[PDB]
Enzyme design. Structure first.
Site, mmCIF file in Angstrom:
data_model
loop_
_atom_site.group_PDB
_atom_site.id
_atom_site.type_symbol
_atom_site.label_atom_id
_atom_site.label_comp_id
_atom_site.label_asym_id
_atom_site.label_seq_id
_atom_site.Cartn_x
_atom_site.Cartn_y
_atom_site.Cartn_z
ATOM 1 N N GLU A 97 0.853 -1.177 0.000
ATOM 2 C CA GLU A 97 0.000 0.000 0.000
ATOM 3 C C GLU A 97 0.891 1.230 0.000
ATOM 4 O O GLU A 97 1.705 1.420 0.910
ATOM 5 C CB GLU A 97 -0.935 0.029 1.212
ATOM 6 C CG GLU A 97 -2.021 -1.027 1.205
ATOM 7 C CD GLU A 97 -2.968 -0.886 2.386
ATOM 8 O OE1 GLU A 97 -2.593 -0.220 3.379
ATOM 9 O OE2 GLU A 97 -4.095 -1.421 2.315
ATOM 10 N N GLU A 156 -7.187 11.029 9.067
ATOM 11 C CA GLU A 156 -6.070 10.170 9.461
ATOM 12 C C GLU A 156 -5.628 10.404 10.901
ATOM 13 O O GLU A 156 -5.849 11.474 11.467
ATOM 14 C CB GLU A 156 -4.878 10.379 8.520
ATOM 15 C CG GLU A 156 -5.195 10.151 7.049
ATOM 16 C CD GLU A 156 -5.639 8.728 6.757
ATOM 17 O OE1 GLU A 156 -6.489 8.544 5.858
ATOM 18 O OE2 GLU A 156 -5.133 7.793 7.414
#
Length: 262
Positions: free
Chosen positions: A50, A61
């Protein structure tokens, strides 16, 4: 065409091997380390990579990812820079699936069709669009489908019936499971319940800090995604003036072994 993600998951499934997928932010702590880090992760047991595209407004986040993106943005790393990194990586690795993780806004700015075309040409196999709810993903899904780019969707303990219906007929490859004080038996129960609703395998994408936890989760889960822990290991090595490749390699390798011995 057969997507690299499907090829890789088929082999894992046949061998009862659980997927291990590290996340790193492209450009962090500096751009020249990213491709080397990618290769090290593969050496140390990554099945899928990723790769995060840095974004200027990552309100969703956690603190560790936020700081990683800030470090990458200091070097002005954007979409085209990330694709160039994927191209460089592909020069000596054609098997390992690469997933691009990012926010919708830079990509829509870039242009959907152009991005999908270039991402596939660069050698990316799918995307995780963190701020694209399934209800809004119809235009994107059609463009991605045209270029053979896979859409990796998120789900959770509370994914609605209709949203799950949205995820099942557009998602490919695998699903990303996240819960948001959560304990392991609750996680197991809720994960298995969500997995029963999914056509695709379900990878646990949060809370994996140690080889021990990785093994505990892999005992019931299809695969495990490691983000904040690896980012932290890398930036701590960099700040201590030690080899980040050694540090990240040792961490992921210990998780690989813990999982395979579990």
């Amino acid at each position: 065409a057969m997507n690299r993600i499907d090829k890789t998951l088929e082999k894992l499934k046949a061998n009862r091997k659980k997927m291990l997928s590290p996340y790193i932010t492209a450009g962090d702590p500096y751009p020249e380390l990213t491709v080397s880090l990618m290769h090290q992760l593969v050496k140390s047991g990554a099945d899928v990579l990723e790769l995060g595209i840095p974004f200027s407004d990552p309100m969703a986040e956690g603190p560790v990812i936020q700081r990683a993106m800030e470090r990458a943005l200091a070097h002005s790393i954007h979409c085209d820079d990330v694709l160039n990194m994927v191209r460089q990586f592909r020069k000596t690795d054609t098997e390992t699936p690469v997933i691009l993780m990012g926010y919708l806004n830079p990509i829509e700015q870039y242009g959907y069709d152009l991005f999908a075309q270039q991402a596939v040409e660069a050698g990316a196999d799918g995307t995780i669009l963190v701020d694209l709810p399934p209800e809004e993903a119809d235009g994107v899904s059609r463009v991605w489908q045209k270029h053979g780019l896979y859409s990796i969707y998120l789900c959770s303990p509370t994914t609605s019936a209709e949203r799950m219906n949205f995820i099942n007929q557009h998602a490919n490859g695998y699903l990303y499971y996240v819960s948001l004080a959560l304990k392991l038996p609750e996680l197991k129960a809720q994960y298995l319940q969500r997995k029963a609703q999914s056509k695709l395998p379900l990878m646990v994408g949060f809370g994996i800090k140690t080889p021990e936890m990785a093994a505990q989760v892999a005992e019931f889960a299809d695969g495990v995604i490691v983000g904040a822990a690896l980012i932290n290991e890398i930036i701590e090595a960099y700040e201590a003036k030690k080899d980040p490749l050694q540090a990240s390699g040792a961490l992921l390798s210990s998780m690989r072994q813990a999982i395979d011995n579990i």
